[PDB]
Coordinates of N, CA, C and O in Angstrom, one line a residue:
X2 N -117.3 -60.1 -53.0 CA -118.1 -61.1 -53.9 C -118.6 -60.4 -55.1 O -119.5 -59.4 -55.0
X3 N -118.1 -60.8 -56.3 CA -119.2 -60.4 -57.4 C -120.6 -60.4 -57.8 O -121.0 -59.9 -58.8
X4 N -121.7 -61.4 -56.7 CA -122.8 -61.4 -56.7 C -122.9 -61.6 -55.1 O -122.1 -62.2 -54.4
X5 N -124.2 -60.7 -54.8 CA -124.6 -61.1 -53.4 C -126.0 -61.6 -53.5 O -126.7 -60.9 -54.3
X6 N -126.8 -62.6 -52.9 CA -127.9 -62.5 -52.6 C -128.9 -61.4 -52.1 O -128.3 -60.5 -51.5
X7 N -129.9 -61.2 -52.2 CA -131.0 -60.3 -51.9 C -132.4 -60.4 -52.0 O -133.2 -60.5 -53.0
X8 N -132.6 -60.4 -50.9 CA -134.7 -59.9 -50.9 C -134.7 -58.6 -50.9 O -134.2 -57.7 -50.1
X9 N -135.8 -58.4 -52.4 CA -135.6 -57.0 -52.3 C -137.5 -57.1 -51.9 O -138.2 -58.0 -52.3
X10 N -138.1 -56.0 -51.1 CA -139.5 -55.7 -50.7 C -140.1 -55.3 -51.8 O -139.9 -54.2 -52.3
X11 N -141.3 -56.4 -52.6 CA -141.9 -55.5 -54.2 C -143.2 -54.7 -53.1 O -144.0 -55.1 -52.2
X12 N -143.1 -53.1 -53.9 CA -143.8 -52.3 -53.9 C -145.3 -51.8 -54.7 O -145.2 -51.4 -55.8
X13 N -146.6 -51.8 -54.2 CA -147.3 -51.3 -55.1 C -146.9 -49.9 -55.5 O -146.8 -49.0 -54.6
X14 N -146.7 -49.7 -56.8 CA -146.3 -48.2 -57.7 C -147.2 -47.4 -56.8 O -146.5 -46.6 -56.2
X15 N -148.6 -47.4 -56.4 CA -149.1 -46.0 -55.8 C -148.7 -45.8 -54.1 O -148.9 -44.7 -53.4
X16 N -148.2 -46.9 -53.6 CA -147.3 -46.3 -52.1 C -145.9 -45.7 -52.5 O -145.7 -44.7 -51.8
X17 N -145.1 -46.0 -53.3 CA -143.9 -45.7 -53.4 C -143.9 -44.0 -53.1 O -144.5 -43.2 -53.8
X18 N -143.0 -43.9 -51.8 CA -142.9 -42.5 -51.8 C -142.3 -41.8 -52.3 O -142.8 -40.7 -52.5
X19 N -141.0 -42.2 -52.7 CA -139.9 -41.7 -53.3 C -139.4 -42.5 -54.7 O -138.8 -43.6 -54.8
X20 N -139.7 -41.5 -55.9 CA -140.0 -42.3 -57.0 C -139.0 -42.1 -58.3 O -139.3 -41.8 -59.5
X21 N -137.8 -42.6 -57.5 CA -136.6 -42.3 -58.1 C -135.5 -42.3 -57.5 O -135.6 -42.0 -56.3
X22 N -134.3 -42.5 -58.0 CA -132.9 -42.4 -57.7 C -132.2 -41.2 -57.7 O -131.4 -40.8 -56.8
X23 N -132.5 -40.4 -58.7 CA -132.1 -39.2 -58.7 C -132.3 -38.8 -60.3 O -133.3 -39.1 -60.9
X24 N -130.8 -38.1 -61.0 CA -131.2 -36.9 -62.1 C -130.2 -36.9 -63.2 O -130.0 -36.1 -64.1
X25 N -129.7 -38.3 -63.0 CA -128.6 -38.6 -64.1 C -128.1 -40.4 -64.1 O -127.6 -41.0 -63.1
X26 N -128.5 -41.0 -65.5 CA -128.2 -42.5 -65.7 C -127.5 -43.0 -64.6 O -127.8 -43.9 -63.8
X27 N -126.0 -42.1 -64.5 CA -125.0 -42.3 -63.9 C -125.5 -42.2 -62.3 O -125.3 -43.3 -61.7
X28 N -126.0 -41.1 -61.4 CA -126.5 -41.1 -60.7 C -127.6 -42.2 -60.4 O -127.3 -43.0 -59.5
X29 N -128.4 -42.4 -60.8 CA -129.6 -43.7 -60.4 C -129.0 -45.0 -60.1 O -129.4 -45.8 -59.2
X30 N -128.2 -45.2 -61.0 CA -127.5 -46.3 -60.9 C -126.2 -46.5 -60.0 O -125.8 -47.7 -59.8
X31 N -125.7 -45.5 -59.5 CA -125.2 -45.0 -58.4 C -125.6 -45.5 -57.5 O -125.2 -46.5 -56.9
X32 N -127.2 -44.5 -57.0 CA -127.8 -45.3 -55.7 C -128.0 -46.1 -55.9 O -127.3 -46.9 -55.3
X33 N -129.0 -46.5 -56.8 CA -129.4 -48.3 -56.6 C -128.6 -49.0 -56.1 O -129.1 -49.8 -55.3
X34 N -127.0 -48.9 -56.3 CA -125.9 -49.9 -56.0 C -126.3 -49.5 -54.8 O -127.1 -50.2 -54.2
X35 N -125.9 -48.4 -54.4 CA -125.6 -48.1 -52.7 C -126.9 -48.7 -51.7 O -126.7 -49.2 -50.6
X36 N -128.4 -48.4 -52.3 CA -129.7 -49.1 -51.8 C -129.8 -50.5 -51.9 O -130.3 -51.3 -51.1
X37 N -129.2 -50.7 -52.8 CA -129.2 -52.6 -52.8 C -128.3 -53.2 -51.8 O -128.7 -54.2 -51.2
X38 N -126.9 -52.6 -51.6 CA -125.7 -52.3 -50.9 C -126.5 -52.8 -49.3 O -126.4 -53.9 -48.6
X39 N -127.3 -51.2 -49.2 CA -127.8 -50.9 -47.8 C -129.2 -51.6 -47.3 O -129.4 -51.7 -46.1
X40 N -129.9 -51.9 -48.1 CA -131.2 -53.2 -47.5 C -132.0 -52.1 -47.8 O -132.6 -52.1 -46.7
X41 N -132.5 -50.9 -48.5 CA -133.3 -49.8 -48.8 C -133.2 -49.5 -50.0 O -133.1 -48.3 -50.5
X42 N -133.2 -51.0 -50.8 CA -133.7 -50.6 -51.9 C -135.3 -51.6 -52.3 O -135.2 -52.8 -52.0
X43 N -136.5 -51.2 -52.9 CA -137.8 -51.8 -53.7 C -137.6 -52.0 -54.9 O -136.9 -51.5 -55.8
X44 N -138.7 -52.8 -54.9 CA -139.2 -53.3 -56.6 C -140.1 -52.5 -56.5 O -140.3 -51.9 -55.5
X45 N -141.0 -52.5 -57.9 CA -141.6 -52.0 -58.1 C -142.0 -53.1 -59.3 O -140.9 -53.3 -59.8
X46 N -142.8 -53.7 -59.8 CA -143.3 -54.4 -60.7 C -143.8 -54.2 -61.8 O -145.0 -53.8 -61.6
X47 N -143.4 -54.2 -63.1 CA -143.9 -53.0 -64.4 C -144.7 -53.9 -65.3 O -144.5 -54.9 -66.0
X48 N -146.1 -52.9 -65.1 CA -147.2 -53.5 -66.4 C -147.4 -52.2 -66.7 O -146.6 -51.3 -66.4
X49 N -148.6 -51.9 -67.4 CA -149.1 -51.0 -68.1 C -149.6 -49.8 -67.1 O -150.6 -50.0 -66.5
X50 N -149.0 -48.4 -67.0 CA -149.4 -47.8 -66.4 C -148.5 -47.1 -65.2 O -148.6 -46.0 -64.8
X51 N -147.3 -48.2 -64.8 CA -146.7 -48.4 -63.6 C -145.1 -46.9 -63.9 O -144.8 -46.1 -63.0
X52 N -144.8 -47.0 -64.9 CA -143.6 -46.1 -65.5 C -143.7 -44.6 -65.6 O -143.0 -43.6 -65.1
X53 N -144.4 -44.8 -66.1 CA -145.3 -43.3 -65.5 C -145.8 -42.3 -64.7 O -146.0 -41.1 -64.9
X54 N -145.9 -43.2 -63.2 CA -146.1 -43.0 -62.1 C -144.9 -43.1 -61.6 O -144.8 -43.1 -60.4
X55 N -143.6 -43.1 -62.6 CA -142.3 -42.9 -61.6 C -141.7 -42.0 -62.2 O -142.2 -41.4 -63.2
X56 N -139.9 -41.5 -61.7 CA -139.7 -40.9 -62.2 C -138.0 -41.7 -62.8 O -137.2 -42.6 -62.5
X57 N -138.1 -40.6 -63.9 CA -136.6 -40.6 -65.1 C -135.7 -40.6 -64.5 O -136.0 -40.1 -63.4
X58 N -134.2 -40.9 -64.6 CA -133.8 -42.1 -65.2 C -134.5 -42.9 -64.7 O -134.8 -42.6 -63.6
X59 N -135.1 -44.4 -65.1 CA -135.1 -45.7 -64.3 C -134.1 -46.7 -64.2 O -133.3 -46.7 -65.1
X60 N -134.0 -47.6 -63.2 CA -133.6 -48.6 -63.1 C -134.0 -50.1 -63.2 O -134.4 -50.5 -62.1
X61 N -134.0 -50.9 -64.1 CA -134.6 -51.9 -63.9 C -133.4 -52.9 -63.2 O -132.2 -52.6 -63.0
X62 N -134.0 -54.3 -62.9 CA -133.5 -55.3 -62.7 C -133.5 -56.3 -63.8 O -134.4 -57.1 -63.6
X63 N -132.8 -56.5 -64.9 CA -133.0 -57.6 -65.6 C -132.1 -59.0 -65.4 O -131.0 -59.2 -64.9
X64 N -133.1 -60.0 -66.2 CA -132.3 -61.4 -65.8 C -131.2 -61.7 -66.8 O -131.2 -61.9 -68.0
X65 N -130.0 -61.8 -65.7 CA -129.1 -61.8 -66.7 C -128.7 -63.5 -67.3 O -128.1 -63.8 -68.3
X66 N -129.0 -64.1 -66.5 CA -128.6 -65.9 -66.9 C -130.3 -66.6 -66.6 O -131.2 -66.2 -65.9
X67 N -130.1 -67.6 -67.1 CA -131.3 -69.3 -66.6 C -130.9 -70.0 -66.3 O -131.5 -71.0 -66.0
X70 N -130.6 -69.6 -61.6 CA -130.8 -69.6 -60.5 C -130.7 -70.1 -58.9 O -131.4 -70.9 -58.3
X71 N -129.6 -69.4 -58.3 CA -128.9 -70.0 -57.1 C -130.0 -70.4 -56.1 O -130.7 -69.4 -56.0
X72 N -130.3 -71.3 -55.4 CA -131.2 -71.2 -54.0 C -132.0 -70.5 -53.9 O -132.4 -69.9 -52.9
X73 N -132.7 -70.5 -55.4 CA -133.9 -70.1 -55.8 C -134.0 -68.2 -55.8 O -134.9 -67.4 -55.7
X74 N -132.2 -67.8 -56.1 CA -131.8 -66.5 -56.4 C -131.6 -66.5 -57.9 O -130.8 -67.3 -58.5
X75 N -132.7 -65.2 -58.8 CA -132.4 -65.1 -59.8 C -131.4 -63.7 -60.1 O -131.5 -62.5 -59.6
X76 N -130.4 -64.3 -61.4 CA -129.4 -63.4 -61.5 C -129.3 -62.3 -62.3 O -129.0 -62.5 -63.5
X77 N -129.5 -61.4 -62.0 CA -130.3 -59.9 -62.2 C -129.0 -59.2 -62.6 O -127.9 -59.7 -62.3
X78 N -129.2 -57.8 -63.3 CA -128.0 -56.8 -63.3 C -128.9 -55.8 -63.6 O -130.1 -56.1 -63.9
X79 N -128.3 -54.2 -63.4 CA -128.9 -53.1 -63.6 C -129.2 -52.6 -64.9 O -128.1 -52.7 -65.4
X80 N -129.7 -52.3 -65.4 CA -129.7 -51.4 -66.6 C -130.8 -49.7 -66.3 O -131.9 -49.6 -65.7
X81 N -130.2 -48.9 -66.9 CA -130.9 -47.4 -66.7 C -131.6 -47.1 -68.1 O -131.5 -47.4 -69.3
X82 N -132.4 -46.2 -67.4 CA -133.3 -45.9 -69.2 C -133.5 -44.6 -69.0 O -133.9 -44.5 -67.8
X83 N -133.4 -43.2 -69.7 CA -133.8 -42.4 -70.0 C -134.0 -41.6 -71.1 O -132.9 -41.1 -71.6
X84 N -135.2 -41.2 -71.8 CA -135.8 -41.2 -72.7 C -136.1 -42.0 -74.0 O -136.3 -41.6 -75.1
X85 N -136.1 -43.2 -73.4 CA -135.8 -44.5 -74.7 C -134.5 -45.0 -75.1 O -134.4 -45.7 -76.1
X86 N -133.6 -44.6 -74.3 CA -132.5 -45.0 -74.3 C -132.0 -45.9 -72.9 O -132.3 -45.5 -71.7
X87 N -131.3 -47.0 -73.2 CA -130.9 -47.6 -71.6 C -129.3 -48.2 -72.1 O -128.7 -48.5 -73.1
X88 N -129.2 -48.1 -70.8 CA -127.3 -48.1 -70.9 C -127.6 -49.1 -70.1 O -128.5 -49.2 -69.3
X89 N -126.2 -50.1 -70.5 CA -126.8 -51.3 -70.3 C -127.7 -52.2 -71.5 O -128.4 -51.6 -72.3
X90 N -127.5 -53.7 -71.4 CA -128.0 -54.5 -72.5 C -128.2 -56.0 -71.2 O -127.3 -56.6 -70.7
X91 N -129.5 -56.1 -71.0 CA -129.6 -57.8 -70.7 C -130.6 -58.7 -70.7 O -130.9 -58.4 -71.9
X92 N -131.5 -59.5 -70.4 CA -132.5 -59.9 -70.1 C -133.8 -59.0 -70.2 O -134.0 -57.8 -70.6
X93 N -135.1 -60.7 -69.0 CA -136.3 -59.7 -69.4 C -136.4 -58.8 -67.8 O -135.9 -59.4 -66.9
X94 N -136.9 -57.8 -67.6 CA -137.5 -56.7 -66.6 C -138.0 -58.0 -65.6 O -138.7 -58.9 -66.0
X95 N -137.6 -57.9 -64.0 CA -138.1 -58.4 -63.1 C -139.0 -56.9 -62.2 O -140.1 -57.0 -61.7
X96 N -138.1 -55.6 -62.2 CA -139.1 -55.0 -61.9 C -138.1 -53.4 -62.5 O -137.2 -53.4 -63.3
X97 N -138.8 -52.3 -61.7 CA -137.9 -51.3 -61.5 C -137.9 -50.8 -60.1 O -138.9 -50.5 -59.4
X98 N -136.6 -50.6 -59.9 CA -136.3 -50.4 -58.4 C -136.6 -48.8 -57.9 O -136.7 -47.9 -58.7
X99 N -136.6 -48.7 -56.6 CA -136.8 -47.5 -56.4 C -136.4 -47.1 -55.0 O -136.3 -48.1 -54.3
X100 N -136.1 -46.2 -54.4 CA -135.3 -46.4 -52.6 C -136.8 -46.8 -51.9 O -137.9 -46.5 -52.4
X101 N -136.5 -47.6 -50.7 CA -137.7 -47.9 -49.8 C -137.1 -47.7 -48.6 O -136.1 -48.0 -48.1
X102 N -138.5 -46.6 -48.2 CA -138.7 -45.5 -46.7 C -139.9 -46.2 -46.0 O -140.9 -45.5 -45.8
X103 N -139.8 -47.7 -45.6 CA -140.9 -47.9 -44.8 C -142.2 -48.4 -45.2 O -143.0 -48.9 -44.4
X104 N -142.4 -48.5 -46.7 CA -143.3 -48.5 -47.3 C -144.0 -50.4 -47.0 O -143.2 -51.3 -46.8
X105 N -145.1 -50.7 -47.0 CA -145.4 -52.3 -46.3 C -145.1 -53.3 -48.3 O -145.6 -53.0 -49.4
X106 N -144.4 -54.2 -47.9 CA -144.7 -54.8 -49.6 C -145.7 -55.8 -49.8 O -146.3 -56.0 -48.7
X107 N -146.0 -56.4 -50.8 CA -147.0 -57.2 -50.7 C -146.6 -58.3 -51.6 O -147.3 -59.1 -52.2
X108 N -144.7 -58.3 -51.4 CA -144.4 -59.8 -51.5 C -142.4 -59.7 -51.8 O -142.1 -58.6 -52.3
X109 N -141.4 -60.5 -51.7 CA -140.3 -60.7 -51.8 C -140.1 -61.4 -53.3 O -140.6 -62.4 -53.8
X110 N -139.1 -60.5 -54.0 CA -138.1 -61.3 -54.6 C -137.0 -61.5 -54.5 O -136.3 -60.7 -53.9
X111 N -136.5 -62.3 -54.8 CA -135.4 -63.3 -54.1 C -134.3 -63.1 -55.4 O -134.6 -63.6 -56.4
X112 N -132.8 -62.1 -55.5 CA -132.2 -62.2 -56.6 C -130.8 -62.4 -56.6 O -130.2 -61.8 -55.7
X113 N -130.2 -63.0 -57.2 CA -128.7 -62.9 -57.0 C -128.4 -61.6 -57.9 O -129.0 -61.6 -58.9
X114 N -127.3 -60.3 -57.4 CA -126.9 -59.4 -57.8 C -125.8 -59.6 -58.4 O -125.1 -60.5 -57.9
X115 N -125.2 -58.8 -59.5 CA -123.8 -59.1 -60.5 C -124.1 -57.4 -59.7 O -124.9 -56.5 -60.0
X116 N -122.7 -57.3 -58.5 CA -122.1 -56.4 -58.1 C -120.8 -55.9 -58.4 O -120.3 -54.9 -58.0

């Protein structure tokens, strides 16, 4: 399937233990597939302060169209140093691997896999 459904667990940025994908655009976006893939991947929800507290490359989720069974349709884009590969919509969050961590709420997205 070129999109699958997903609840992803949104995380507060100060539990997130693991605060990143790894060490290259190509790499982050790597995992993410494979975390998204595997049910071990979070959100992370970005305001002021939140980006900072993670680490380079990121990955966001942005919205790529205006929603299936109340699934919004998201794609990846990576950012490192002010640069993001990738072009789409606005930021629903940025993702990050989840080890257990409790969320304090579900987003519901369809993925362009």
């Amino acid at each position: 399937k070129t999109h699958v459904q997903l609840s992803l667990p949104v995380l507060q940025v100060r539990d997130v233990l693991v605060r990143g994908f790894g060490d290259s655009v190509e790499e982050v976006l790597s995992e993410a597939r494979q975390h998204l893939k595997d049910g071990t991947c979070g959100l992370v929800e970005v305001e002021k302060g939140v980006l900072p507290q993670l680490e380079q490359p990121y990955v966001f989720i942005k919205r790529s169209d205006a929603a299936p069974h109340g699934h919004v349709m998201v794609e990846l884009v990576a950012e490192l140093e002010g640069i993001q590969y990738g072009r789409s919509g606005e930021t629903l969050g940025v993702l990050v691997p989840h080890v257990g961590e409790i969320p304090v709420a579900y987003r519901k997205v369809l993925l362009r896999k």
